[PDB]
Paper text:
Tripartite α-PFTs are members of the ClyA α-PFT family. Proteins in this family undergo a large scale conformational change from a compact soluble structure, where the hydrophobic residues are hidden often within a β-tongue motif, to an extended pore structure with the hydrophobic residues exposed in two extended α-helices which insert into the cell membrane. Here we show that S. marcescens has a tripartite haemolytic α-PFT (SmhABC), and propose a mechanism of pore assembly. We present the structures of the soluble A component (SmhA), as well as the soluble and pore conformations of the B component (SmhB).
As expected, soluble SmhB folds into the family observed β-tongue structure, with a five-helix bundle tail (α1, α2, α3, α6, α7), and a head domain containing three α-helices (α4, α5, α8) alongside a four-strand β-sheet (β1, β2, β3, β4), which includes the β-tongue motif (β1 and β2). The head domain of SmhB is largely hydrophobic. This is particularly evident in the β-tongue and helices α4 and α5, which together constitute the predicted hydrophobic transmembrane region (G175—L233). The B and C components interact at a binding interface located around residues 95–123 of SmhB, this could break latches 1 and 2 on the B component, releasing the β-tongue, C-terminus, and N-terminus to initiate the transformation into the B component pore conformation. The release of the C-terminus from the β-tongue agrees with the observation that the start of the conformational transition in NheA occurs at the C-terminus. This is further evidenced in the structure of a second crystal form of SmhB, where comparison of the B-factors for the two chains in the asymmetric unit revealed high flexibility at residues 85–124 and residues 280–320, corresponding to the proposed binding sites to SmhC and SmhA, indicating that movement in these binding regions can occur to facilitate complex formation.
Author numbering: 4 to 204, 207 to 366
The structure:
Amino acid sequence: PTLYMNDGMNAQSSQALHIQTYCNSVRQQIPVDFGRFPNLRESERQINTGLGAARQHAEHYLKDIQPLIIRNVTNIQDYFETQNLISTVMPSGATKEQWLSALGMVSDKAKEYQEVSANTRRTIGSLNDKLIIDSNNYQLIVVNLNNVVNGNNGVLEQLNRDIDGINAAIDGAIAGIVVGGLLVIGGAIVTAIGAVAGLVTTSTPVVMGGIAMMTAGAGGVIGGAIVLDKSLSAREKLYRDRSQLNSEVLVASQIGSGYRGLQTQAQSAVTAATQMNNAWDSLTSELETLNANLRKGIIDDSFLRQLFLTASQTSVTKVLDGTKIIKQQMAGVVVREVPANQSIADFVKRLAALEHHHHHH
């Protein structure tokens, strides 16, 4: 259970930094301006209404959920510091009753923290559910606009699936970068937000879902930009290839892709939250089994003492080490401003060229 707890914590913490950055990109998205086309006023208002709801979903995550996930790390640290302390306090000839008191104190903490993880899982499950509905309904606003300007709905839908497909690649590259950097002592996570497509001027730039996450090592040395550059540039390319689509349909499409991308992050958060809740479940079960087996007299104090002792010398070390690195990295995220005349792909491409020069390669 100690390693299950470790893996749950690592997966939820890394994914939490990913959806956090995605939510920031949704919050920073500027309303769409189709002022130059009075006949698209209705579409402009439907798109800004859906965007407002997306910003509220993102805000809900940042303010109401992110802190519970960070609280979970702290709860893991307190749990294991407490289990460890039991090991150092219980003297030699401690009675069954004293051991039952001690087991009780750790089971109470574990159940308290299991319930916090469970409530976190429900809250993210609900947000994911709402995002599935809102992102699915948003697509009708885009088709409707495409119909108002007699665009080809086949070409639009193809672009939508192509962007979904490249977003899996971008997500997987960001996930691998963050997982790989989460447990580096002295390492930091670096994020940037920027337009998802190449810029062209009077169209509203879409930063929603335009994210980069990279690592920084000793001396602020960026890692991950070379890897990430490939999938970011590919998205920019896929948009470039549909410059025959109406400009406003393209913007509307970019928000839709950002709305679906947000729902994808929330599904990843559900999966991580489930894995963490299952880890707590197996921790409380183990304690309940030790509580019953000591009472049934199937085990004894001596076994329990050695069980907690070994744990404290072994897998608990890894968890406690992880809790400290994870809190530093989640608290030390470095936010890079992207200039208004650079896409997220442009920005990372420039960081990738700097990364090549630092590697002399």
